[PDB]
Structure 1
């Protein structure tokens, strides 16, 4: 459909700084051009200027709470605008803590949205269950209504308001979940397909079940938050926390081709691309190239081929 690109050069949700270059390398790879090369109407809303917050000491164990909270607050506003302009928001990250603002802004315009979270992690730790203190591993806890009451008043997030229920989200690709996160998973009855379920059923059945689970009762807007470390590091090595045994390039493209075909993609996040972590220049291009491929699939690029509504013969 119509696209609204939003750059989110933010890294304070985790320790490694290079992730704020994600928007830069993705654009430099010709993402806007490639999208236009397709039947896509693209409007670049530019990179959000995330002001520096010098005074931002930890809230207990949680690091850079004000910087993270403000960045998501700013992003939520931009996403809500692009959604109001009738465009599918495409947020280029940036660490995953930004999901808080992206999904929040998306839900302001489309409260009935459903979320598909592709990631090796659940990122559902609360400020009290986290052991790392990195906010990119907590975005989901801030968004779930069932958890409001388990989230302390962390500086920078007073603007947040839980917008989704445990049943409005599906996880795909999980392979490194913390104990508390697993407890929340089972306690709230969240639907997930860890790498174990992908191995058992095959990605085809996984997507069939995912889309049926989220669109069964009725059709609703879909928000896809894609963490590049959800895919195996043999495809996306330049990322902060890679975990072996990931989703293949093919599975990544399958997930997105299927989501595109629903015609319900409403919001998209391409997160955790960190060029500074590429062991080689090739590891960087390999990661960025895969990230672009996944993005293009979300907007119609199909492996069986594509053609214009004309008679080619």
Structure 2
């Protein structure tokens, strides 16, 4: 099958990057919804690399305020190795999360095979706090800081992260859907001159102009691999309520679909993260199903499913 429809699925049932239990069930609920079957139904070559085994680290003391550092660092180290393996096999890595701390391992692993990659980060949050600027101490709100080359010398020696080498420059990342950014994060975003489309820019320009500007900024100079790190809380809680850090006034279901349809069309999607789906956090059974169905729809759009329709290269009027 086509490169843009050749996929390597990695389950990452990890929750210790944040304090809310349940996000480790994200891979289970996405698989039960029939993600793999639905992808095969749209002419995808799907290989399931299974769920990564995350061994318990019982004596995981905090680094200052930073919680579960060895567990988070090890999970990302393991994921980096697995993503690099998937990438070497000529497949688009599809990481089923799990909390967003896992992006450390997902992007690190992807950069080992494709160092020229560009990142599209769909989230309500920047996730760029350092272990020193964080007030929460949750590593799911810090993955971008460990990855950026410009933040080298600002990341202290955190236990479990000695394997980390910053793999992306501030110019190689574009944020979409921002609406809840810490002061420390806003300082970083502005001082490093990172490209971003907060909800203010989405409202001003429309998602059409947002995507036109995002893809031109990342691909204008030359075609390069795209890594889409999708936090379901990027979309409004009316679509993805079963998530840990929901923020009102989010991207619509349509905008989420549009972003992913435009990324598919480039033929350059090389890595994908579907993060922060927490089935324990739906106020009703319907809120869980709604979140899972939305996450599945986003994923299908990444691999070719289009709202105008799709057809096989045959003559439907003369079978």
Q: For the superposition of Structure 1 and Structure 2, which TM-score range results when normalised by the shorter chain?
A: over 0.9
In structure 2, the gaps of 5 or more residues are none
Matched length: 313
Deviation, 1:10, is 0.1
SS of the counterpart of 1:162?
Answer: coil
1:107-122 matched pairs, under 5 angstroms = 107-122=111-126
1:123 aligns with 2:127: yes
1:68-87 matched pairs, under 5 angstroms = 68-87=72-91
Q: Deviations over 1:224-243 (max 9, x none)?
A: 00000000000000000000
1:185-224 matched pairs, under 5 angstroms = 185-224=189-228
Residue aligning to 1:235: 239
Residue aligning to 1:66: 70
1:1-313 matched pairs, under 5 angstroms = 1-313=5-317
SS of the counterpart of 1:17?
Answer: coil
Q: Deviations over 1:60-87 (max 9, x none)?
A: 0100000000000000000000000000
Q: Deviations over 1:179-210 (max 9, x none)?
A: 00000000000000000000000000000000
Q: Distance in 2 between matches of 1:246 and 1:13?
A: 23
SS of the counterpart of 1:50?
Answer: coil
Q: Distance in 2 between matches of 1:300 and 1:14?
A: 32
Q: Deviations over 1:42-76 (max 9, x none)?
A: 00000000000001010001000000000000000
Task: Give the alignment's Cα RMSD to 1 decimal.
Answer: 0.3
Q: Deviations over 1:127-158 (max 9, x none)?
A: 00000000000000000000011000000000
Structure 1 stretches of 4+ with a deviation exceeding 4 A read none
SS of the counterpart of 1:16?
Answer: coil
SS of the counterpart of 2:22?
Answer: helix
SS of the counterpart of 1:90?
Answer: strand
Deviation, 1:218, is 0.5
Deviation, 1:17, is 1.3
SS of the counterpart of 2:47?
Answer: strand
Deviation, 1:39, is 1.2
Q: Distance in 1 between matches of 2:38 and 2:91?
A: 18
Q: Distance in 2 between matches of 1:67 and 1:161?
A: 18
Q: Distance in 1 between matches of 2:102 and 2:152?
A: 19
Q: Scaled by the length of structure 1, what TM-score is found?
A: 1.00
Q: Distance in 1 between matches of 2:159 and 2:199?
A: 35
Q: Scaled by the length of structure 2, what TM-score is found?
A: 0.98
In structure 1, the gaps of 5 or more residues are none
Q: Distance in 2 between matches of 1:221 and 1:152?
A: 30
Q: Deviations over 1:240-285 (max 9, x none)?
A: 0000000000000000000000000000000000000000000000
Q: Distance in 2 between matches of 1:279 and 1:149?
A: 43
